[PDB]
Amino acid sequence: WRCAGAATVLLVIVLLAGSYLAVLAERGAPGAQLITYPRALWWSVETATTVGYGDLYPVTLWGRLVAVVVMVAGITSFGLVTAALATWFVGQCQQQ
Amino acid sequence: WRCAGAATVLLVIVLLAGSYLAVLAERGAPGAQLITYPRALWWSVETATTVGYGDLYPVTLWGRLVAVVVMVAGITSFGLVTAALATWFVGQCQQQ
């Protein structure tokens, strides 16, 4: 429970940093749709969760490098929050 | 730590090989967008991470067979780097 809350804080820091760095990298490329923070934060969630909606994605080199940072840090930190909430529900099954 | 670095090297070898083989297989199909290495390397990352941006994908038989190789080898090797970095963060929780 104490470690699960830490992984949540790590995930939020990746999302805010990944959203800010994506806008900073994509602005300047003709045709980039990842140019505002409110939806770049939504893109960082799509990346961390790998939900695959395919509506926003980076088109630049650094914007894709920022995505790789959000991929490695996001999928890992989200997998921890997923596994932590999975063990919590497992304990609720034995309690019944 | 020693085994985690090996899975990273395996992943990079799959990405470079999967990027080179995708361009070699997709070039020759009218309408293929996976025809240059810089973005075929970005496609191989999308495949290994299953992020699901849906902007580049193969359209040929072998290019899809190369994708299956990148799927089996990439998702596995990336799941190891994800689980390894997940256990590292778990050890940082007990240390606090």
Add this chain to the structure above:
Amino acid sequence: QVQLQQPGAELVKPGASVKLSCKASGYTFTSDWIHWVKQRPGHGLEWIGEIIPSYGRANYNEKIQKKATLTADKSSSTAFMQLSSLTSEDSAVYYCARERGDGYFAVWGAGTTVTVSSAKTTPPSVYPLAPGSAAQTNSMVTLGCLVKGYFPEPVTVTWNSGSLSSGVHTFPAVLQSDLYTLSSSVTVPSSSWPSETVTCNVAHPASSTKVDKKIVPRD
């Protein structure tokens, strides 16, 4: 208060350079981008470039000639634009706008009227326009003042320091021998004038001159 401050005008010779300022005030965040919009006389708004002062990175319009350099100083909260090698095609009003990173330009500046010409800065000459001695007086009396022979644009004409806003017209200037000339009309009730004082306030930021002139009836 004024969130974004800009100088009045900037006169430059064809081929020279100039540094336009955009002083900010109020709330400032790290997600704030400063933009610049060019508007030529009689034309629409044209995006020039953007810059995020918290990082120092700036982007420019790739579809037009890149004649600007966007800089920023976080200490004074003032963004700059270096318009170099200017020609007649660069005489426009350059607005700066603040973007909260969400896309739109919520707050704008006042615009800097940049003129590119070899002529010299000429302060205006204000003259009172009082009605003639044989002019009939109805319930309303129309007064005016003549702003003649100034360069470059623009001039800000106000009556009674802004307290006389209704019934006031300021006609566009007409260029004559590299010298502009416009006129400003004010209509007050004849019961108020000349019992109540009226005075026009003409400003010229290109010469840093601001002159007043009371409208006194003819002796």
Add this chain to the structure above:
Amino acid sequence: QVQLQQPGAELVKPGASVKLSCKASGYTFTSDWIHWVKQRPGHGLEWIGEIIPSYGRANYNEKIQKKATLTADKSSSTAFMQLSSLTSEDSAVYYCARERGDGYFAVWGAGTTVTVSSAKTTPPSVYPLAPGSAAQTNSMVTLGCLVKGYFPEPVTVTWNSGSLSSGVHTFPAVLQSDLYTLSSSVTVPSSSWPSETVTCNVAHPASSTKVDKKIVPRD
């Protein structure tokens, strides 16, 4: 140095075959693709096919007639194209270009002027064009040389082995009875000629002939 080398010209009879070469030099990687671009006289660039020498796989233009065969030899770093069963519609300049796998053609060749005709290879005939004895001399004197009766195209005409590049015109050839004829003009200061030697250098790669001719004033 020249990164991609190509022969000058290739004359073939209607219905024959030819093997165009593209010798490479300098940096070579495994991600390098060799392309071929056809340009007919008076027409634009036309993509023909690509090949990656490190693997041996080649792709061709499916929208036009597939009359080429792309091969490559990694030892000599030379790519080949087998143009078989050629007709009048195949008389074009075939450029080869190197692609780093990133899409664009960074470095190009010189182009091989392939002509399909039943005529025979005729070396050119160079004649000096000195001014007449009654020709007036100003600050500049215009000299020339006549390249007549050669086949097929092209010819490379240089003055003083390239050191006289300014004030030099080489008019396009005109076809006359299956024999081309053009002229090259050079203008040097009259103070330099004939005190300083001038000489045209006409080359004909279809006959592997390269002839010089000094411009001496008439006796």
Add this chain to the structure above:
Amino acid sequence: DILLTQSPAILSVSPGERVSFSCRASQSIGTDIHWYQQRTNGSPRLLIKYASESISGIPSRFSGSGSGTDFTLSINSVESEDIANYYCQQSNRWPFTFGSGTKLEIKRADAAPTVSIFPPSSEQLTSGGASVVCFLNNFYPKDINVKWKIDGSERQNGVLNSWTDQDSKDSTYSMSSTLTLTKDEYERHNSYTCEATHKTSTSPIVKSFNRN
């Protein structure tokens, strides 16, 4: 590069009715369009953000709509202070692009101009210059012609005319006619006259003054 085509460029409206400004995009941009208002000698003022979301302080008569490629800015019952130039701007793809703009014209009732003639000032006569200013304020429509007469004969040389845009207070127009002369030529004549010829009366409105 998104091409925001605004059509029409001028919108002639009767007061009190509903009007719509159209702004078409070169491709589908979702609802990432924004509307700005710029009056005469003013700065662009944000009206609508994200197609329909209103801005605090803007009157709710301004209503936005549209998605994809077609967008609409609507003013339910127009008024005089709405006479301005309206620009749409997209933020869906970089770079941000604006629209060609649309000017709002109001078709009010016809009005007669208030003619006011002014002899040259003493501060100007004592310096060589002499300019007779004749104001023609608050008239509609903008079609009008002024004529300068000197001692009964028509004068044309030295007449400068300056028309304002449609007034953002009463939907009228205004015109200033300035006749510039010399200190001598002004003091070699007596009566100076500017005659306003508008469609509100077959007989012109005459304002004169005698120098002597």
Add this chain to the structure above:
Amino acid sequence: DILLTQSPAILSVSPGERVSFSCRASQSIGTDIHWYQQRTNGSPRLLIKYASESISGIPSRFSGSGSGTDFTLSINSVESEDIANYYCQQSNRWPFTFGSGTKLEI
């Protein structure tokens, strides 16, 4: 098969002013367009890569722009050595296609 339509085909320009070459694509290709220069009896020389990125050695008077379907090659103040044929080429989809070309007249 991407159809890169270049219009106009001949561009008559006065010296010292800015000129623009238009190159429209049959469909959206992103910024995967490239610009080449070929003079009389010469080989195509790469000017701009990826819509706007410049090439080393090419004078910075050549500026590129455009994304999606419309693309623009701009020469700020033209000069005599710019008289050539300019071709745009896409690399977004296979096969690579060129444009009809545009000649620069001064």
